[PDB]
Amino acid sequence: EFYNFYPEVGLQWMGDNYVFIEGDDLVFNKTTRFSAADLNALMPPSFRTLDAGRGLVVLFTQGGLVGFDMLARKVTYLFDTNEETASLDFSPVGDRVAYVRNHNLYIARGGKLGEGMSRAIAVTIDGTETLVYGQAVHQREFGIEKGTFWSPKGSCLAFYRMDQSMVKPTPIVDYHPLEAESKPLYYPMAGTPSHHVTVGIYHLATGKTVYLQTGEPKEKFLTNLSWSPDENILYVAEVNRAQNECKVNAYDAETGRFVRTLFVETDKHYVEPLHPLTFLPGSNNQFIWQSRRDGWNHLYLYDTTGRLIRQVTKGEWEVTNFAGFDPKGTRLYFESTEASPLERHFYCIDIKGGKTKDLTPESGMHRTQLSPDGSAIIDIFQSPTVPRKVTVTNIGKGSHTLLEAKTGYAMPEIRTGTIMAADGQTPLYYKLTMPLHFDPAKKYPVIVYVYGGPHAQLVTKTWRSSVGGWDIYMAQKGYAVFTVDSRGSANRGAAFEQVIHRRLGQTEMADQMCGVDFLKSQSWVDADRIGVHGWSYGGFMTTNLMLTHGDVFKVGVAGGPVIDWNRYEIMYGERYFDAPQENPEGYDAANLLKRAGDLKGRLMLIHGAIDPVVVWQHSLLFLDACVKARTYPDYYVYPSHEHNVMGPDRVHLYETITRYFTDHL
Amino acid sequence: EFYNFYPEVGLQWMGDNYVFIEGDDLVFNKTTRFSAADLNALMPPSFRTLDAGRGLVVLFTQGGLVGFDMLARKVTYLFDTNEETASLDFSPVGDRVAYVRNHNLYIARGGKLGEGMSRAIAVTIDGTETLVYGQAVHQREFGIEKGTFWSPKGSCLAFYRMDQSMVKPTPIVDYHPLEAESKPLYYPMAGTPSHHVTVGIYHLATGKTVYLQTGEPKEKFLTNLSWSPDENILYVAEVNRAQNECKVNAYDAETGRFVRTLFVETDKHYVEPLHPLTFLPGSNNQFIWQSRRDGWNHLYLYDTTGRLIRQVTKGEWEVTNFAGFDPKGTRLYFESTEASPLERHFYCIDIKGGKTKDLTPESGMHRTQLSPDGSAIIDIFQSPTVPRKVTVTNIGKGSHTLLEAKTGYAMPEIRTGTIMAADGQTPLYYKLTMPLHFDPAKKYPVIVYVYGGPHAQLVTKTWRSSVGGWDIYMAQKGYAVFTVDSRGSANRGAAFEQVIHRRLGQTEMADQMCGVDFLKSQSWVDADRIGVHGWSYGGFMTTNLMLTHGDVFKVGVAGGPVIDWNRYEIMYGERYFDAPQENPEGYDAANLLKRAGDLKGRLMLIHGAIDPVVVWQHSLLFLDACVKARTYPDYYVYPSHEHNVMGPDRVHLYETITRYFTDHL
């Protein structure tokens, strides 16, 4: 997932009050306070909210976790997960927590003050390096971010069982010990055998476990597990290897037996379920399902028989976040791009459909939180002219501004606009960061910062940078930085994105060159000093651009670059490129190893040695291919980092990257 | 071992004639010929000579090996080693060959034309990745280059059995397969448990195997195995972990029982046996032993009771190669530095000792081959003024010149001289490659090409370059290249070398800076543009110099650099540095990872990913240390190469290295 480093917010709901920290106190407002001392006075700070409605949180302290009720100001339970915190998943009942330790899934029960503790229960006992329990599966695709799913009333715990013994692993080497130590990473590459995932359901009352009878193919992707409100059924969105069919099936939670198929979604290119079924309040028969079936992500209302009652939201825009319903379940609240693809607004719409009502009309980026009630919202706004403006509003009533931020020196000027894609019809939005102290009478070198892969959108109406401030940093050194969201990028509908199917890099590069044509039309641009930089999909693009248009891009820096898609994962890779065996021509055209001989400019590849997203092998083989082809790239490796360089070391990364450009461009 | 790439010779003895190839024929001279057709006419080209005296060779052809008698012009035997050629060791009888395949040692018997073949015999059957048979052991130190040793009459085959199950391996990754594949390299690092080597003796007549009862410590180094001429005893030079004691022991070949200790050698710093016992012709009781015990490598005459009869050669010079004896065993023939450490001459000396007689007096580098007879010699000469001069001489009689090689353009001028070491007493020899088209009135950048590790000497009276011509290539780009053999380097006696003991890098750098003082005294040298380059020990030096004298060395390129000696091998490492636990101060001072923050110039490290000499971890951890220290080196990796980049890819290496200097220095 594309991440904007160096972000420049404790706000949230607890009961019917919005709460935020102020270093010492936790301020509740409709305006009471809770000092760290008062809290500590109840202990036998940072915390994770478990139930916003009830204001129940869990405090991470030395020697266990401490559940605490912020509204009643009382300790709930003390939990002992043997120091495990990464996989913690608390039951909705709040008195139990599931977690994974040493390959196995466990359930720990909270203990009340001075009531004694109980030993956790082992749901599984045969976990191993090739048999994973309760963890994310399918490479975290399809919205999967964990492997434990509590039933609504806490009666059962569903979990993933991933047998990856048939997956040929990649070595991940830790160079810190005296002798380096390798550990296998079961990264399933495109076209190879995938892992086998099954779903288990542990019944807490009986201690019995049953597995869903999902059948064959065993490689089928089991996604978006969703429990029925009454806990009798567990719904699963099953996706085939081709990823062009998604069947929403209901399974009997008691026996694991298949019950029925509610509906099936198909697509010419690919179907991609990303969200679970969300049942209407108080209903066990109606639920909202998100789908991009009509070319745009919208909310669909289904009954559990599989009948589509109605497509609630409609239009050439996309729902970017479903926030929930009103108490009675007659209204839907969500964030969308209706106002503009470059903006995010919070809307309300009748469950019967119709016109939407924008609740945050100010132009810019709105990130909103619906209160447990459904009566008020916390809104955090920002725009090119507005750093941030925090607002709390009683839907319908008035709005209260909690905060709103707003020199003798300078900052890089940021220009924005639109240009036509390579098809001459589709408009592309760009962001141009001007050199510091820009002089319209002078010529300047320019660097295209590119990503261009699906799921990301770098050009929005936000405050400052969207790429970790790297564009601003480069600009401070006299280099303009240009970025354009080429076709394939997100939040512009399926057509805009799927044009890249089976042909990664082709349309993307054509659109990026339209960006270059725009830059060359600028009189202040030195057409002979154009560079390019990107990470991940952007690393692939950076490299592909230098090999494909070596006369234009003189210098480039590619981080964690995908070089050979046959070596990228099955799930993400085969969705956009199909399988290697089904698309030799597309894969061959994007295989940068085959065109290393076309590198005539200066290019530095950068890689984290323990990168589990883009395996190190990608950049190493590119250098190898360059040796054979007699071309000369440069290199740098961060042995302690994974896909991206985070933390203070990112300073070293920026210095390395920028100096390469100031040295050679 | 330091290797001079891009060398700029088929000569050898066969019976009493010197032979060399001429593309088509094999010319024998006292002058007969043997065309490839005539030979092929006898087949049911390149070859390996097995017995120079009898002119027996083995031809490598598709579908087996073909033994051939060049003097009698007849096929001897056909050998089937199942395509194994790397470990081939032919019995002195010439009708059998030992080899290793799939972890086990085998003996194959040659088959005569149309006489049928016999299946090879398996000497061992339990070989594994952690149990190696018949291969070099102890990291190829102590002169060990193989693991099979035939007894003189071919009655027995002695071999190494190395149990390395207690050695913690280093992963060597092959990045070519779809998913990278790692293989453990049992590289024993300094201070850790060493492997356990034992010696087995396979008796061909009975098929029985007995192991020498070498006892404990099991880590003891078993070196220079030497068979008694009568095959009843197998001598072994045993070296302790401290490497300050070497005991020459005799073992009963029949039972493996210890018989007696002939003599023991000790040293304040280290003892290093490098050659086997060589018995006098026709004698089973007297042998020549090479030893540097008196500060210089000389030939010692011992009787098998252990009594030292006499030190045959003596003087402040070293025997660099023992060629053998005269027929009657009253004279010794050898190559030495008596004439000059910068030269190599072939000498003769009475077995009683006394004055030596130089048989190749011309100043320069003589590489000589003593005929099977001991009456004549083949001499290949070269000097700064003489490319090459091939001579064949009947010792005592006259000399015949077989070949002697000798423009409107230019070549880099090479200057040589001497400077005082940092002690102000020891003279150091240097080689200075001047910039092409050198103009004494101009200023030039200069690069110090350094190695400086033990066992190597880069400055000798040879033709052209001694460092793969890299110095000449750099000079052609306008950069002078300077090299000085600092203390620690070879062929200057033990005192000159052992000054580095327990303090690697310290004296070496001090002497290299004396070289810098010399360069700065030259008016044509731009003191602000001094660089440094080296490989292996030279990579360690290059890096250490930039960190220690960052004000002087502006740019450097370090290949396969040792960065942390705690991560270098036990055998070589502990000899010169002692164990990490015994010398914290020395190791700490040479640990470049601890001073990465001192890098203020431009430094590119280069490494072969599958390097089994200097594990990749060395340069990777240096970059890692630089990230933490906020310093910025550059990098390049050759994924398909081991310690050095050989073959056509070396062109890419030279371009990469030189461009770094032309870009930054």
Side-chain angles (χ1 to χ4, degrees), chain A residues 1-29 31-61 63-114 116-405 407-463 465-665, chain B residues 1-29 31-61 63-114 116-405 407-463 465-665:
Chain A
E1 179 178 2
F2 194 81
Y3 186 67
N4 167 57
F5 292 79
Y6 295 103
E8 300 168 51
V9 182
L11 278 174
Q12 65 177 294
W13 291 102
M14 292 203 94
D16 54 298
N17 323 300
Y18 52 99
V19 181
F20 64 83
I21 298 179
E22 187 167 353
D24 180 16
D25 311 65
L26 188 63
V27 183
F28 300 68
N29 306 290
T31 173
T32 314
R33 283 195 159 186
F34 199 21
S35 173
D38 298 69
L39 173 63
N40 192 60
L42 297 172
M43 300 301 277
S46 56
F47 58 78
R48 178 188 303 185
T49 295
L50 308 181
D51 184 354
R54 305 194 60 179
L56 301 180
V57 309
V58 63
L59 302 157
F60 296 70
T61 310
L65 316 167
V66 180
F68 198 76
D69 188 318
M70 284 297 159
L71 303 182
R73 299 189 179 181
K74 288 184 176 180
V75 169
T76 53
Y77 309 83
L78 304 173
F79 301 85
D80 184 354
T81 61
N82 286 165
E83 291 184 352
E84 172 56 31
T85 63
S87 60
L88 296 176
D89 185 355
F90 295 78
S91 157
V93 176
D95 69 331
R96 289 186 162 73
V97 60
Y99 68 89
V100 179
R101 187 190 179 195
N102 290 314
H103 305 303
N104 294 296
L105 177 60
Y106 297 80
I107 291 178
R109 181 165 184 173
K112 280 192 170 184
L113 285 171
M117 296 296 271
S118 185
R119 188 189 183 187
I121 295 173
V123 181
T124 66
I125 64 170
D126 71 339
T128 305
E129 71 168 49
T130 61
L131 188 56
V132 195
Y133 288 108
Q135 303 271 50
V137 301
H138 305 321
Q139 293 290 301
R140 306 179 81 83
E141 285 296 305
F142 316 109
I144 299 166
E145 55 189 56
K146 64 173 184 166
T148 56
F149 310 84
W150 284 99
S151 61
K153 304 173 184 178
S155 303
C156 312
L157 177 62
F159 60 88
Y160 282 133
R161 174 181 186 282
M162 179 167 64
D163 174 3
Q164 52 191 15
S165 61
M166 69 295 298
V167 176
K168 190 159 174 296
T170 284
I172 290 302
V173 188
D174 172 17
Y175 288 96
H176 293 297
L178 184 61
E179 304 91 350
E181 302 172 355
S182 63
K183 168 166 40 56
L185 177 72
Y186 292 83
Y187 191 95
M189 293 178 172
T192 70
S194 186
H195 44 238
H196 294 174
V197 172
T198 51
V199 173
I201 298 178
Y202 175 74
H203 291 265
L204 284 70
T206 70
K208 174 192 181 186
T209 296
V210 295
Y211 282 79
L212 302 193
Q213 286 166 30
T214 43
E216 302 192 299
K218 294 188 189 66
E219 295 188 330
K220 70 182 65 182
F221 307 130
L222 307 184
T223 83
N224 302 93
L225 276 50
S226 308
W227 280 94
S228 62
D230 74 353
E231 307 188 311
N232 289 313
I233 294 175
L234 179 52
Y235 298 92
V236 184
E238 297 171 36
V239 185
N240 62 350
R241 180 79 187 234
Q243 294 190 57
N244 58 17
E245 176 193 290
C246 298
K247 305 174 64 169
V248 174
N249 292 333
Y251 287 85
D252 182 73
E254 181 65 59
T255 65
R257 293 172 63 191
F258 166 74
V259 177
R260 64 178 185 283
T261 293
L262 278 70
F263 64 90
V264 183
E265 273 191 41
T266 64
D267 189 81
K268 172 189 171 185
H269 303 291
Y270 49 86
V271 183
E272 176 177 35
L274 296 164
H275 308 88
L277 288 64
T278 303
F279 287 74
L280 307 205
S283 178
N284 186 62
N285 309 315
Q286 299 179 65
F287 63 84
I288 292 294
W289 169 256
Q290 298 194 50
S291 177
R292 210 185 201 189
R293 71 182 62 172
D294 79 353
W296 311 79
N297 189 57
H298 284 296
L299 307 173
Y300 293 73
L301 176 68
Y302 277 91
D303 104 307
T304 51
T305 67
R307 174 174 67 94
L308 170 58
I309 299 175
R310 164 194 318 122
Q311 184 183 330
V312 184
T313 60
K314 302 175 182 176
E316 301 198 302
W317 44 271
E318 311 202 72
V319 169
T320 50
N321 187 244
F322 176 43
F325 325 74
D326 59 349
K328 307 177 188 302
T330 59
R331 294 178 175 182
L332 295 189
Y333 294 93
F334 58 94
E335 170 195 289
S336 84
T337 61
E338 184 176 359
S340 168
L342 309 181
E343 296 175 47
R344 296 294 183 282
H345 293 216
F346 196 66
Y347 302 76
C348 178
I349 192 176
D350 192 295
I351 189 66
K352 307 168 188 176
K355 300 185 300 177
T356 58
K357 183 170 190 173
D358 184 353
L359 303 178
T360 60
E362 184 156 54
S363 182
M365 299 294 276
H366 288 279
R367 268 43 245 270
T368 316
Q369 303 175 62
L370 178 63
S371 69
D373 280 38
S375 61
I377 57 173
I378 295 173
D379 186 60
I380 303 177
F381 173 74
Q382 66 166 296
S383 67
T385 54
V386 178
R388 272 183 178 174
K389 184 179 184 181
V390 174
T391 300
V392 175
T393 301
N394 295 305
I395 299 178
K397 293 181 173 297
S399 301
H400 180 191
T401 296
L402 282 56
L403 177 286
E404 183 172 4
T407 66
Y409 28 98
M411 278 295 285
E413 188 207 326
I414 296 181
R415 296 181 181 178
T416 56
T418 304
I419 60 174
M420 283 300 109
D423 62 359
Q425 311 170 189
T426 310
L428 308 180
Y429 304 96
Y430 73 73
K431 196 177 191 171
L432 178 61
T433 307
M434 303 304 280
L436 183 66
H437 311 306
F438 173 67
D439 186 320
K442 301 192 63 181
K443 282 285 191 174
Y444 296 85
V446 59
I447 297 168
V448 171
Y449 179 83
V450 59
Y451 181 68
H455 282 296
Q457 171 181 31
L458 286 49
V459 182
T460 60
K461 189 171 296 185
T462 187
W463 172 258
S465 176
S466 173
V467 303
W470 182 82
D471 59 311
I472 295 179
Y473 186 32
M474 197 62 249
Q476 291 179 310
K477 294 189 171 185
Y479 292 65
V481 177
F482 180 82
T483 292
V484 61
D485 278 321
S486 37
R487 282 175 288 165
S489 57
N491 308 303
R492 287 290 296 281
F496 183 93
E497 175 187 308
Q498 304 185 313
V499 60
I500 70 177
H501 191 232
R502 289 178 67 86
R503 312 175 311 107
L504 304 191
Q506 294 176 46
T507 299
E508 302 90 305
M509 288 197 286
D511 285 359
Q512 288 298 313
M513 294 311 283
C514 281
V516 173
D517 292 324
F518 169 74
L519 291 177
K520 286 181 176 182
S521 290
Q522 299 298 292
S523 70
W524 53 272
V525 164
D526 185 327
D528 300 316
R529 301 178 68 193
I530 294 180
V532 57
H533 175 50
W535 207 280
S536 209
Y537 202 96
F540 159 65
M541 286 296 292
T542 289
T543 304
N544 204 350
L545 283 171
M546 286 195 76
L547 298 181
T548 307
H549 301 289
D551 283 335
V552 176
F553 303 94
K554 303 295 190 300
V555 185
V557 178
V562 179
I563 298 293
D564 173 4
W565 288 87
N566 195 159
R567 290 181 164 96
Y568 202 66
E569 69 171 64
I570 292 174
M571 302 85 222
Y572 176 110
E574 298 184 2
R575 174 183 309 120
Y576 312 100
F577 231 163
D578 275 350
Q581 307 91 315
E582 316 171 311
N583 181 27
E585 291 180 50
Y587 274 74
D588 284 349
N591 189 344
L592 309 191
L593 298 178
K594 292 179 180 294
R595 296 183 279 121
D598 293 338
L599 175 66
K600 59 178 177 183
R602 299 303 298 259
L603 169 67
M604 174 188 275
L605 290 76
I606 298 179
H607 221 126
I610 57 176
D611 186 338
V613 178
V614 173
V615 295
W616 195 9
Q617 171 181 47
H618 283 274
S619 62
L620 290 164
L621 285 181
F622 187 70
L623 297 201
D624 192 73
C626 281
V627 175
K628 283 57 182 290
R630 293 286 177 71
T631 51
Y632 308 77
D634 285 295
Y635 202 49
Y636 202 90
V637 175
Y638 287 82
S640 301
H641 290 278
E642 302 189 284
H643 193 45
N644 280 289
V645 179
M646 311 174 286
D649 286 350
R650 198 172 182 73
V651 172
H652 182 288
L653 175 69
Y654 281 19
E655 280 298 324
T656 298
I657 299 171
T658 62
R659 186 178 69 174
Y660 196 72
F661 282 112
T662 63
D663 276 351
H664 305 293
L665 184 56
Chain B
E1 179 178 2
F2 194 81
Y3 186 67
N4 167 57
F5 292 79
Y6 295 103
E8 300 168 51
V9 182
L11 278 174
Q12 65 177 294
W13 291 102
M14 292 203 94
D16 54 298
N17 323 300
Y18 52 99
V19 181
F20 64 83
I21 298 179
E22 187 167 353
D24 180 16
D25 311 65
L26 188 63
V27 183
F28 300 68
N29 306 290
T31 173
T32 314
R33 283 195 159 186
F34 199 21
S35 173
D38 298 69
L39 173 63
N40 192 60
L42 297 172
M43 300 301 277
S46 56
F47 58 78
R48 178 188 303 185
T49 295
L50 308 181
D51 184 354
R54 305 194 60 179
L56 301 180
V57 309
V58 63
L59 302 157
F60 296 70
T61 310
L65 316 167
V66 180
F68 198 76
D69 188 318
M70 284 297 159
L71 303 182
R73 299 189 179 181
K74 288 184 176 180
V75 169
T76 53
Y77 309 83
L78 304 173
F79 301 85
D80 184 354
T81 61
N82 286 165
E83 291 184 352
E84 172 56 31
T85 63
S87 60
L88 297 176
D89 185 355
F90 295 78
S91 157
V93 176
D95 69 331
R96 289 186 162 73
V97 60
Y99 68 89
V100 179
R101 187 190 179 195
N102 290 314
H103 305 303
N104 294 296
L105 177 60
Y106 297 80
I107 291 178
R109 181 165 184 173
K112 280 192 170 184
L113 285 171
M117 296 296 271
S118 185
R119 188 189 183 187
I121 295 173
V123 181
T124 66
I125 64 170
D126 71 339
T128 305
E129 71 168 49
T130 61
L131 188 56
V132 195
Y133 288 108
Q135 303 271 50
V137 301
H138 305 321
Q139 293 290 301
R140 306 179 81 83
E141 285 296 305
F142 316 109
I144 299 166
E145 55 189 56
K146 64 173 184 166
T148 56
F149 310 84
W150 284 99
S151 61
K153 304 173 184 178
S155 303
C156 312
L157 177 62
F159 60 88
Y160 282 133
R161 174 181 186 282
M162 179 167 64
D163 174 3
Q164 52 191 15
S165 61
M166 69 295 298
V167 176
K168 190 159 174 296
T170 284
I172 290 302
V173 188
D174 172 17
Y175 288 96
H176 293 297
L178 184 61
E179 304 91 350
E181 302 172 355
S182 63
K183 168 166 40 56
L185 177 72
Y186 292 83
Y187 191 95
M189 293 178 172
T192 70
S194 186
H195 44 238
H196 294 174
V197 172
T198 51
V199 173
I201 298 178
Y202 175 74
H203 291 265
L204 284 70
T206 70
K208 174 192 181 186
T209 296
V210 295
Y211 282 79
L212 302 193
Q213 286 166 30
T214 43
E216 302 192 299
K218 294 188 189 66
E219 295 188 330
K220 70 182 65 182
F221 307 130
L222 307 184
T223 83
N224 302 93
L225 276 50
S226 308
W227 280 94
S228 62
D230 74 353
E231 307 188 311
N232 289 313
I233 294 175
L234 179 52
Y235 298 92
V236 184
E238 297 171 36
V239 185
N240 62 350
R241 180 79 187 234
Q243 294 190 57
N244 58 17
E245 176 193 290
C246 298
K247 305 174 64 169
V248 174
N249 292 333
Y251 287 85
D252 182 73
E254 181 65 59
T255 65
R257 293 172 63 191
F258 166 74
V259 177
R260 64 178 185 283
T261 293
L262 278 70
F263 64 90
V264 183
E265 273 191 41
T266 64
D267 189 81
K268 172 189 171 185
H269 303 291
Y270 49 86
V271 183
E272 176 177 35
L274 296 164
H275 308 88
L277 288 64
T278 303
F279 287 74
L280 307 205
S283 178
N284 186 62
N285 309 315
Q286 299 179 65
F287 63 84
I288 292 294
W289 169 256
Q290 298 194 50
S291 177
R292 210 185 201 189
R293 71 182 62 172
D294 79 353
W296 311 79
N297 189 57
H298 284 296
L299 307 173
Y300 293 73
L301 176 68
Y302 277 91
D303 104 307
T304 51
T305 67
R307 174 174 67 94
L308 170 58
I309 299 175
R310 164 194 318 122
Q311 184 183 330
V312 184
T313 60
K314 302 175 182 176
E316 301 198 302
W317 44 271
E318 311 202 72
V319 169
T320 50
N321 187 243
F322 176 43
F325 325 74
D326 59 349
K328 307 177 188 302
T330 59
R331 294 178 175 182
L332 295 189
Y333 294 93
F334 58 94
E335 170 195 289
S336 84
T337 61
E338 184 176 359
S340 168
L342 309 181
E343 296 175 47
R344 296 294 183 282
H345 293 216
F346 196 66
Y347 302 76
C348 178
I349 192 176
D350 192 295
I351 189 66
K352 307 168 188 176
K355 300 185 300 177
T356 58
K357 183 170 190 173
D358 184 353
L359 303 178
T360 60
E362 184 156 54
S363 182
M365 299 294 276
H366 288 279
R367 268 43 245 270
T368 316
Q369 303 175 62
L370 178 63
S371 69
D373 280 38
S375 61
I377 57 173
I378 295 173
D379 186 60
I380 303 177
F381 173 74
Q382 66 166 296
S383 67
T385 54
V386 178
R388 272 183 178 174
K389 184 179 184 181
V390 174
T391 300
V392 175
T393 301
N394 295 305
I395 299 178
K397 293 181 173 297
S399 301
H400 180 191
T401 296
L402 282 56
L403 177 286
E404 183 172 4
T407 66
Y409 28 98
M411 278 295 285
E413 188 207 326
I414 296 181
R415 296 181 181 178
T416 56
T418 304
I419 60 174
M420 283 300 109
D423 62 359
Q425 311 170 189
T426 310
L428 308 180
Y429 304 96
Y430 73 74
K431 196 177 191 171
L432 178 61
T433 307
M434 303 304 280
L436 183 66
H437 311 306
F438 173 67
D439 186 320
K442 301 192 63 181
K443 282 285 191 174
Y444 296 85
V446 59
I447 297 168
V448 171
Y449 179 83
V450 59
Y451 181 68
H455 282 296
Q457 171 181 31
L458 286 49
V459 182
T460 60
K461 189 171 296 185
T462 187
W463 172 258
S465 176
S466 173
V467 303
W470 182 82
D471 59 311
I472 295 179
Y473 186 32
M474 197 62 249
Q476 291 179 310
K477 294 189 171 185
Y479 292 65
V481 177
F482 180 82
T483 292
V484 61
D485 278 321
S486 37
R487 282 175 288 165
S489 57
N491 308 303
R492 287 290 296 281
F496 183 93
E497 175 187 308
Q498 304 185 313
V499 60
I500 70 177
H501 191 232
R502 289 178 67 86
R503 312 175 311 107
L504 304 191
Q506 294 175 46
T507 299
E508 302 90 305
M509 288 197 286
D511 285 359
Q512 288 298 313
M513 294 311 283
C514 281
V516 173
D517 292 324
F518 169 74
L519 291 177
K520 286 181 176 182
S521 290
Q522 299 298 292
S523 70
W524 53 272
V525 164
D526 185 327
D528 300 316
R529 301 178 68 193
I530 294 180
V532 57
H533 175 50
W535 207 280
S536 209
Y537 202 96
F540 159 65
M541 286 296 292
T542 289
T543 304
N544 204 350
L545 283 171
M546 286 195 76
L547 298 181
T548 307
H549 301 289
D551 283 335
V552 176
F553 303 94
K554 303 295 190 300
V555 185
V557 178
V562 179
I563 298 293
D564 173 4
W565 288 87
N566 195 159
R567 290 181 164 96
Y568 202 66
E569 69 171 64
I570 292 174
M571 302 85 222
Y572 176 110
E574 298 184 2
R575 174 183 309 120
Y576 312 100
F577 231 163
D578 275 350
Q581 307 91 315
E582 316 171 311
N583 181 27
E585 291 180 50
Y587 274 74
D588 284 349
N591 189 344
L592 309 191
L593 298 178
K594 292 179 180 294
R595 296 183 279 121
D598 293 338
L599 175 66
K600 60 178 177 183
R602 299 303 298 259
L603 169 67
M604 174 188 275
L605 290 76
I606 298 179
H607 221 126
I610 57 176
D611 186 338
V613 178
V614 173
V615 295
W616 195 9
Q617 171 181 47
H618 283 274
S619 62
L620 290 164
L621 285 181
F622 187 70
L623 297 201
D624 192 73
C626 281
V627 175
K628 283 57 182 290
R630 293 286 177 71
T631 51
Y632 308 77
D634 285 295
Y635 202 49
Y636 202 90
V637 175
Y638 287 82
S640 301
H641 290 278
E642 302 189 284
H643 193 45
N644 280 289
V645 179
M646 311 174 286
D649 286 350
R650 198 172 182 73
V651 172
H652 182 288
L653 175 69
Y654 281 19
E655 280 298 324
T656 298
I657 299 171
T658 62
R659 186 178 69 174
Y660 196 72
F661 282 112
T662 63
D663 276 351
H664 305 293
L665 184 56

